[PDB]
């Protein structure tokens, strides 16, 4: 849609259950960088995502 | 059909109204037992049994 946040109505359903005694207060998403073989004249490197 | 990962059901009362066994992928609908009672129609003890 035009906006990422929707206006319609939709419920949820269970998926899984993992039992572990570990506290969770903050998370962090993981980013994978694809190796880029740039030409010498590009003069670009360091990050790509 | 039921939910993709649902297990049981219910109805107007607290009674359940569903069962799932993906092996059979079965869906049903539940109702209360037939139930019955008796009423006696007698002309009178002193008239005829
Ligand atoms: C570990 C196990 O019991 N897995 C079964 C799976 O093989 C089967 O297809 C499904 C629905 O029958 O129920 C569950
Ligand atoms: C029933 O009918 C008979 C017939 O007259 C009467 O004698 C009697 O009092 C009535 N009642 C009962 C309980 O029998």
UniProtKB/Swiss-Prot annotation, chain A:
Phenotype upon changing residue 4 to G: In strain: Beta/B.1.351
Effect annotated for changing residue 23 to Q: Increased resistance to neutralizing antibodies
Outcome (variant: residue 42 to N): In strain: Lambda/C.37
Highest taxon of the lineage: Viruses
UniProt-annotated stretches for the region Disordered: 35-49
Result when mutating residue 42 to G: In strain: Iota/B.1.526
Sugar-modified residues: 23
Assembly information from the UniProt record: Binds to host ACE2. RBD also interacts with the N-linked glycan on 'Asn-90' of ACE2. Cleavage of S generates a polybasic C-terminal sequence on S1 that binds to host Neuropilin-1 (NRP1) and Neuropilin-2 (NRP2) receptors. Interacts with host integrin alpha-5/beta-1 (ITGA5:ITGB1) and with ACE2 in complex with integrin alpha-5/beta-1 (ITGA5:ITGB1). May interact via cytoplasmic c-terminus with M protein. May interact (via N-terminus) with host bilirubin and biliverdin, thereby preventing antibody binding to the SARS-CoV-2 spike NTD via an allosteric mechanism.
Function of the protein: Attaches the virion to the cell membrane by interacting with host receptor, initiating the infection. The major receptor is host ACE2. When S2/S2' has been cleaved, binding to the receptor triggers direct fusion at the cell membrane. When S2/S2' has not been cleaved, binding to the receptor results in internalization of the virus by endocytosis using host TFRC and GRM2 and leading to fusion of the virion membrane with the host endosomal membrane. Alternatively, may use NRP1/NRP2 and integrin as entry receptors.
Identification of the protein by name: Spike protein S1
Gene label: S
Residues of the full protein shown: 212 to 260 of 1273
